[PDB]
């Protein structure tokens, strides 16, 4: 019946994996909430855990914090009785173990130790927020001393600490107040660094925490407009090399735009130093994304026309020897920071900004690299580098057409994007400029996780447009050939191609004849129920009574 | 890409693609049966010989196909009919998608084979094990067997004018589900809709049945119950064979003195178009309409206009993946590739080395085996090890993810 929790406690001071995991697993059971073991047996377990955490060989500590986490999560009485004492012990060990950091990270287990301690503190103070009476008198006299330690530790371990301070700053905006300057310093020291040794997650977290720093109606607006105003100097610095006023409607808009960062220097004899310009614009875009896409405890003014104008002027930036070669690569990356901002302005706000959904699609044509000589032809060698960016473009288009829907008039950007997507759907080879008797082994074959993205884009195109003939026949040939190839290689057809053939059957558009019976010939032993309804239709849905 | 025709006469084994004008005559083949050939596991072709009591096995995977017999398979009895139950739903790895390639060794689960006097032999193919033998199912013969869904149900037809629907789990571990006596003379063929679902409760699956009674009977299959017919037609000529369009838009019937067509979405003289086959799930009336066919030389009299395509004494029919070409086998041992609309032959395939076209097949394509056990039955033993031969097949095996790995890596160094 009952597993005698004293037995778990006494077998816990020594327990390796295949015993310790059973101890943690059986302690989930709710029958340890019951009369007259609530003052004499849980006390024994908690004193055992406390003796494990208070002094140990750094294995009993890891074991102990995991044990307290599981116990407090699956038993609210242990929380309401002893959570303050457990959290005090864990914070004390964290404090002594972060008083030194370069003698505690010396053995490849200090990192995991900080991970488990920080995670355990976070989990405890994420369960003591559903109890007002308990968030008093166990956390609030302790956060004043918890938070400076976490700040000092975030200088070295931002990937692990910053979500905790983010949640604490968000749920408590009045105890983080007198430490706020001390936080800001470290965040400017983490942005003044190279800022590419940090991951995307860490970059986003420092941006988000700097954004939530300004919670202390109006300060959010000041920080937001400061970051928005730090865009125009960089663009005018880029305008001394692209020679604007060749097109004046752009230069009218550039001067129509409205601080801790260094004013940067550029040298043309060292063209690699031109990689500072994208690596500042991406930074400011991340900070802007943080100020915009985050939740708040109050509403906020967000300028949408301003950032739309900013995105519009970013994608206008396009068309001694190696310098020209380096200029031919930074500019797509510059445009992509307009793409990356419209993708967040679209999904998070949705139909707000419906007015801008037609200009974005026209401006995406500027992102496409054309051949240099005079022509409207696509430069496929540049497109081979830009794969992730064009995937982001495809997701942006699919985000827009969820709201716009089917479109009467057609535009030219979609046909060029289809040509791009059909180029990217071909198995790349990188020996074409020239063997060793086998040039077919030097290919980069396209996974199915990429074909899914391409096929979702073609679904969006065939749904909402009556396309021209040749950009339709290419799609049909692609779908049929690849489906047959995969049905030979495999014994089946993946689901994205089936969805593509479904859309090709349902939405033929300008065609005078469907591809229905060929889809069924391919779907011979892979049956599906869409075409049953099409060929063998059903009685309506209310005739039955 | 192109389509591939595998047809065999009583003394000839030709294989040829439709748009290639190249062909391979298999050396040793003999048949006097209507449907006796099958293509097994995209690596093999099985043909049941006549008057030898064995199956010939040809390897058809090569770039230069094996003209000769790759292998033989003796049997207990000479048997006429064949059908295969293809294994599906094993290559995706539904637990997590890895999209396994096919192995070099693949096989189906079953090999249905039926002989004269109505006996049915079914064999596991991964290991030759005769799981079950039904001594008598039809009481004169069997002429065609087909698995309509993947391995779920199989349908049989013989010369007792009864078409039987089994259930594969109730046949291999028999008491069939339903029997169909609506014909009076031997049922020579049937066909089922190429468009199908995963189940029968939410589909209306059409079964066309054809006999020497000069009738064509269209049955609605949706059970959960018995099937209900909703139309039957009638013919002046002794009908022999039948195929459908790949979407159940038409019917094409092969018979003595020509091959005839029939539109199922029948267009009247008001620009009014009537679907003869309308139905639902299990709720459906039993009032099967009657109509009669008459050639070309408006339907409330009980007559319908079939359009004559050809004048050849056809034995068998098949259809292309487009749904626009018929491949018809005459009694002079040659195939005609014809176009449905214009009624103009485009190609004529003969064999080179004679009897009629026994059977033929088509599927599109792009540019050892166990011995069968003669009278042995795997019983209710549990200590028996039901060993099979099997192979799984490898799974299919960018840069921004690599750079993100690099960015996460760089933080650990203080240098």
């Amino acid at each position: 019946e009952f597993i005698a929790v004293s037995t778990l406690a006494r077998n816990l001071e020594i327990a390796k994996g295949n015993e310790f995991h059973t101890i943690l697993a059986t302690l989930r059971s709710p029958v340890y909430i019951n009369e007259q073991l609530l003052k004499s047996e849980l006390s024994f377990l908690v004193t055992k855990i406390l003796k494990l955490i208070r002094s140990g060989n750094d294995f009993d500590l890891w074991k102990g914090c995991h044990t307290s986490v599981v116990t407090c999560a699956y038993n609210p009485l242990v929380l309401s009785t002893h959570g303050g004492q457990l959290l005090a012990a864990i914070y004390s060990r964290l404090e002594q173990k972060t008083g030194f950091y370069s003698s505690v990270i010396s053995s490849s287990h200090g990192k995991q130790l900080f991970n488990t301690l920080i995670s355990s503190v976070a989990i405890i103070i994420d369960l003591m927020k559903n109890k007002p009476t308990l968030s008093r008198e166990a956390l609030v006299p302790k956060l004043k001393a918890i938070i400076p330690t976490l700040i000092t530790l975030s200088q070295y371990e931002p990937e692990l600490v910053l979500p905790v301070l983010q949640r604490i700053l968000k749920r408590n905006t009045t105890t983080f107040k007198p430490f706020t300057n001390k936080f800001r310093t470290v965040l400017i020291n983490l942005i003044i660094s190279d800022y590419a040794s940090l991951g995307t997650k860490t970059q986003r977290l420092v941006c988000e925490n700097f954004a939530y720093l300004h919670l202390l109606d109006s300060n959010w607006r000041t920080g937001l407009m400061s970051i928005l105003s730090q865009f125009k100097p960089i663009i005018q610095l880029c305008g001394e090399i692209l020679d604007f006023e060749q097109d004046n409607e752009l230069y009218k808009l550039i001067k129509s735009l409205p601080e801790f960062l260094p004013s940067l220097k550029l040298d043309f004899n060292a063209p690699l130093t031109l990689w500072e310009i994208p690596q500042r614009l991406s930074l400011l875009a991340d900070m802007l994304v943080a100020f915009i896409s985050l939740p708040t405890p109050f509403p906020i003014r967000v300028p949408l026309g301003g950032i739309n104008s900013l995105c519009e002027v970013l994608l206008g930036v396009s068309n001694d020897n190696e310098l020209n070669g380096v200029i031919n690569t930074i500019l797509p990356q510059i445009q992509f920071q307009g793409i990356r901002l419209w993708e967040i302005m679209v999904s998070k706000y949705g139909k707000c900004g419906l007015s801008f959904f037609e200009g974005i699609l026209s401006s995406i044509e500027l992102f496409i690299p054309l051949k240099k000589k005079s022509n409207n032809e696509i430069d496929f060698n540049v497109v081979g580098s830009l794969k992730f960016e064009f995937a982001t473009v495809f997701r942006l288009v699919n985000m827009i057409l969820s709201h716009l829907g089917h479109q009467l008039n057609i535009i030219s950007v979609i046909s060029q994007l289809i040509e791009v997507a059909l180029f990217l759907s071909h198995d790349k080879t990188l020996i074409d400029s020239l063997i060793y008797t086998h040039p077919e082994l030097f290919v980069c074959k396209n996974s199915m996780n990429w074909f899914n993205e391409i096929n979702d884009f073609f679904i969006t195109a065939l749904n909402n447009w009556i396309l021209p003939s040749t950009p339709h026949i290419q799609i049909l040939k692609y779908s049929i050939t690849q489906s047959l190839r995969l049905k030979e290689r495999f014994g089946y057809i993946p689901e994205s191609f089936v969805n593509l053939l479904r859309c090709e059957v349902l939405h033929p558009g300008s065609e005078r004849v469907s591809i229905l019976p060929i889809a069924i010939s391919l779907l011979k032993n892979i049956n599906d129920d869409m075409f049953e309804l099409l060929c063998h239709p059903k009685v309506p849905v209310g005739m039955v009574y | 890409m192109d389509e591939q025709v595998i047809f065999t006469t009583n003394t000839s084994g030709t294989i040829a693609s439709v748009h290639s004008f190249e062909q391979i005559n298999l050396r040793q083949c003999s048949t006097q049966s209507r449907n006796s050939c099958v293509q097994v596991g995209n690596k093999y072709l099985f043909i049941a010989q006549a008057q030898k009591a064995l199956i010939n096995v040809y390897n058809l995977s090569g770039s230069f196909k094996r003209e000769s017999v790759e292998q033989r398979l003796p049997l207990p009895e000479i048997l006429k009919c064949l059908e295969v139950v293809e294994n599906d739903g094993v290559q995706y790895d539904r637990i997590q998608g890895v999209n396994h390639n096919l192995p070099d060794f693949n096989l189906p689960y079953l090999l249905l084979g039926s002989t004269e006097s109505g006996k049915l032999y079914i064999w596991e193919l991964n290991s030759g094990i005769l799981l079950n033998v039904k001594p008598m199912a039809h009481y004169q013969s069997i002429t065609k067997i087909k698995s309509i869904l993947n391995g779920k149900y199989i349908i049989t037809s013989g010369n007792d004018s009864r078409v039987i629907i089994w259930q594969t789990v109730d046949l291999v571990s028999p008491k069939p589900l339903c029997i169909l006596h609506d014909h009076t003379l031997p049922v020579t063929d049937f066909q089922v809709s190429s468009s199908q679902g995963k189940f029968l409760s939410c589909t209306d699956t059409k079964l066309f049945t054809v006999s020497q009674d000069a009738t064509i009977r269209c049955y609605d299959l949706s059970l959960i119950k018995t099937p209900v017919l909703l139309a039957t037609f009638t013919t002046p000529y002794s009908i022999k064979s039948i195929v459908l369009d790949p979407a159940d838009r038409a019917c094409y019937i092969g018979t003595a003195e020509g091959c005839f067509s029939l539109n199922l979405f029948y267009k009247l003289k008001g620009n009014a178009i009537v679907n003869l086959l309308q139905s639902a799930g299990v709720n459906t009336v039993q009032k099967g309409r009657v109509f009669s066919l008459v050639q070309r030389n408006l339907y409330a009299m009980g007559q319908l206009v079939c359009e004559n395509v050809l004048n050849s004494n056809v034995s068998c029919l098949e259809i292309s993946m487009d749904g626009t070409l018929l491949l018809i086998g005459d009694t002079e041992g040659k195939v005609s590739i014809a176009e449905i609309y214009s009624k103009q032959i485009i190609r004529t395939i003969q064999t080179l080395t004679v009897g009629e076209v026994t059977n033929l097949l088509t599927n599109p394509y792009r540019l050892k085996i166990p011995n069968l056990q003669r009278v042995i039955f795997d019983g209710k033993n549990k200590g028996h090890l039901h060993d099979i031969w099997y192979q799984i097949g490898e799974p299919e095996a960018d840069f921004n993810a690599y750079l993100e790995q690099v960015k996460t890596q760089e933080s650990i160094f203080s240098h």
Partner: peptide, 24 residues
């Protein structure tokens, strides 16, 4: 007129070029 019916012209699906082989 209807896309999902048998058309009234002889060679449909000739403009998809599935079965053609281009000469090089």
């Amino acid at each position: 007129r209807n896309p999902y019916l048998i058309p009234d012209y002889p060679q449909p699906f000739e403009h998809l070029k599935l079965f053609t082989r281009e000469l090089k």
